[PDB]
């Protein structure tokens, strides 16, 4: 029985799900909605603070709620909320997810340790490292270690700021302070732990999480710099160096350039941003940030969770604010993580693939891509045709295109273990979708759609790139909603199918296996739902330094 049927039943209570007819214009407009009535009340109370400047007013322009205004179920949860509660401005959990990614930087420690021993004649032991890690957990949040008459950051404002360490060296890991260790053997299943260590070797990395209040006041480009400064101060302090000598410049260069792992890369001038902003986060990098892979053996579940997080990051926040703004793109995104709709399509595709090919059962060929993509797209289309309340739910073509093609693309990747086969399947789904309904998405939805097949397996200049390494700055992808979140899923899909510990970078995967993060990256869906219900506590609030 269809996975979305439960949610549709509650969303359209007491209505015949087969009936193609319904009643409109009978709800009292916006007053049907508890959330809209709340909004209207706060707007009225705001007149005084605003000194009479006009504000939110439901009587301006369109009279919302001529139809019934839907609630949405966050997929996999019991949270039924009005869509407004999923808007990124209204959802502190979405905000904290973005900030947690933004404020994270990884730095190799072996190069610094080589500087200490070869240039400075200082010996590095597990004990000195434990001392160093204590120093930086004082320095990173803004505490002084070397100079007299330093002013300091209020600790109450930066409790989310800390540094941890992980290493492929099990013997070293056994000797480090457990309070600041990310333990690979503890956080990952045994076979995944082995795969990670086979790439990492016995190298050691620190994970620095800059204060949330800092990236909110400033930006992503602040983070690797903030990290590096206090790494520098901490080495000087813990190892009793001259506070400013030639060898110190090697620490800085390592921490800022040679040995640093950032979440995202810089943008071109037309859409200029520094490192660690969402546009620079490649799809496979985001897949590795999401932690579902190490707590679930269900490839559909791992992909679906990645897509939920990616919907919030790429469409709601990045495209819906950074690159545009206003009311924004909440429901372009929620289509990919509510009412268990995408789930149904994806689980259909996975079962189809498992029976016919087996999971990772065949080499990628165009025959296989055509077979799977066509089958899954047809099935997804027929669902919107068979259920009038489903079509009324995903009322925008872009939503329907993204969800159907995501199922097509992931399923293709599930079968072949190839992400580029996956997106080639995605583009087939789109033009097939278009012929079936004589429509697709919004005015400029299928720019990348029509360019897609040809560039999916291209090897030329700015066309060819392994899909995992593509991201929001890949030229065809730079502009439009309803693609990027799903591309993150497709990047994850073959690695989930393979049971890989990671998609693109083992260091990023390990760096977010951390219970002390505010956002729960093992399940983006559950955190977002908690934010929707206003049950999520974000970091970086300023109540301690402002009037009551």
């Amino acid at each position: 029985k269809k996975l979305f049927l439960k949610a549709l039943k509650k969303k359209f209570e007491g209505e015949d799900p087969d009936e193609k007819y319904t009643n409109f214009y009978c709800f009292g407009g916006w007053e049907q909605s508890a959330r809209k009535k709340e909004f209207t009340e706060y707007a009225k109370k705001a007149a005084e603070k605003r000194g009479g400047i006009p504000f939110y007013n439901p009587d301006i322009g369109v009279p919302l709620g001529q139809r019934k205004l839907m609630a949405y179920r966050v997929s996999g949860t019991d949270a039924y909320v009005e869509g407004d509660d999923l808007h990124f401005v209204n959802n502190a959990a979405i905000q904290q997810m973005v900030d947690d990614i933004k404020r994270t930087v990884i730095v190799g420690m072996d190069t610094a340790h080589a500087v200490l021993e070869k240039r400075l004649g200082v010996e590095v032991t597990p004990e000195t490292i434990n001392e160093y890690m204590e120093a930086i957990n004082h320095a990173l949040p803004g505490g002084a270690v070397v100079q007299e008459h330093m002013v300091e950051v209020h600790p109450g404002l930066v409790e989310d700021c800390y540094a941890k360490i992980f290493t492929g060296d099990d013997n070293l890991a056994d000797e480090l302070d457990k309070r600041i260790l990310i333990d690979i053997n503890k956080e990952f299943p045994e076979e995944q732990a082995e795969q990670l260590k086979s790439y990492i070797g016995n190298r050691t990395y620190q994970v620095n999480r800059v204060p949330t209040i800092v990236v909110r006041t400033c930006d992503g480009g602040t983070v690797s710099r903030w990290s590096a400064m206090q790494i520098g101060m901490s080495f000087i302090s813990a190892y009793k160096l001259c506070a400013g000598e030639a060898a110190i410049a090697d620490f800085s260069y390592a921490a800022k350039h040679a040995d640093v792992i950032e979440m995202g890369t810089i943008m071109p001038a037309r859409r200029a941003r520094g490192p660690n902003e969402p546009g620079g986060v490649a799809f496979g990098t985001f897949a590795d940030i999401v932690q579902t892979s190490r707590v679930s053996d269900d490839p559909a579940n791992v992909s679906l969770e990645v897509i939920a997080g990616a919907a919030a990051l790429y469409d709601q926040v990045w495209l819906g604010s950074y690159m545009s703004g206003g009311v924004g793109f909440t429901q372009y995104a929620t289509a990919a993580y509510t009412d268990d709709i995408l789930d149904d399509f994806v689980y259909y595709g996975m079962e189809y693939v498992d029976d016919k090919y087996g999971i990772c059962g065949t080499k990628p060929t165009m025959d296989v891509v055509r077979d799977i993509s066509t089958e899954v797209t047809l099935y997804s289309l027929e669902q919107y045709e068979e259920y009038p309340t489903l079509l009324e739910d995903h009322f925008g073509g872009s939503q329907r295109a993204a969800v159907a093609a995501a199922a097509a693309g992931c399923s293709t990747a599930f079968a072949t273990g190839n992400s580029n086969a996956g997106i080639n399947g995605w583009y087939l789904s789109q033009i097939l979708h278009k012929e079936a309904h004589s429509r697709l998405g919004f005015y400029g939805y299928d720019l990348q759609d029509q360019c897609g097949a040809s560039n999916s397996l291209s090897i030329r200049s700015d066309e060819g790139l392994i899909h995992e390494l593509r991201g929001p700055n890949y030229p065809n992808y730079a502009m439009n909603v309803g693609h990027q979140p799903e591309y993150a899923g497709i990047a994850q899909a073959p690695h989930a199918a393979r049971g890989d510990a990671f998609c693109t970078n083992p260091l990023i995967k390990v760096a977010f296996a951390d219970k002390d993060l505010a956002f729960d990256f093992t399940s983006p869906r559950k955190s977002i739902a908690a934010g929707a219900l206003r049950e999520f506590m974000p970091e970086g609030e300023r109540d301690l330094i402002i009037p009551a």
Binding site: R67, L378, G397, N424, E435, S438, R439, I459
Partner: protein
Amino acid sequence: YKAQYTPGETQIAENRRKHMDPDYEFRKLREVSDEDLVKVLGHRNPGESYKSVHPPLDEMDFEEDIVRDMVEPIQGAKEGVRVRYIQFADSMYNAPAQPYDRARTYMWRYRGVDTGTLSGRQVIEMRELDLEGVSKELVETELFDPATTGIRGATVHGHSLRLDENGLMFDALQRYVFDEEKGHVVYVKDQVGRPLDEPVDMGQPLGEDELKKITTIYRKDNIAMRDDKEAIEVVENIHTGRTLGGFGMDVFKDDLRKRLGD
């Protein structure tokens, strides 16, 4: 050369071909006066002369351009008339015309066309004079079900929704209403929602059964896409050609050989 228009072995594909085929004349189902048409368009008053955006072509002086002067300008462009629009929502419950269907039809059949396709709306921007000529054909013929084809320049929500209690498509601004007495759809507002002094009667809705026969959308409870294997095959062929072309190494193998030669 005998044009094919579109692939497919079902009636849906055939309906699309007939729309695009210029030698097929649309069946006229209803009468709409010029004045009512101008009124619903909401751009100007009936009786006033067309307004210009630039001087007439003969009052302007052009340098010689053989290529340009080989192309016949439409009447509205000759007279320098401003560009205006008409916009439809087409219900996914078998509206007689559908969005890309419209666009392909327009580009085969009309001259000087600017048309944008979207899931919830389809728009034409054209010289106002020529727009009115075109628009008449678009509302009087089988391309237009007053129940499932909404004229709307903004707040277009409805193509994906269930029909209302009277079988009419949702319109958040209710530019048309159901006349219970005659069983007619009547426009009481222009396409952007300005109330009309005198409402415009668009006639009776087409039957559900008639729409199933003439619609250009594939639906499972009518004719499913899955049943048109020919159409699917050609779609995949287009996808495949694009993929191999993008990769290039095989389809251009002879070109590469020469570059490598000697």
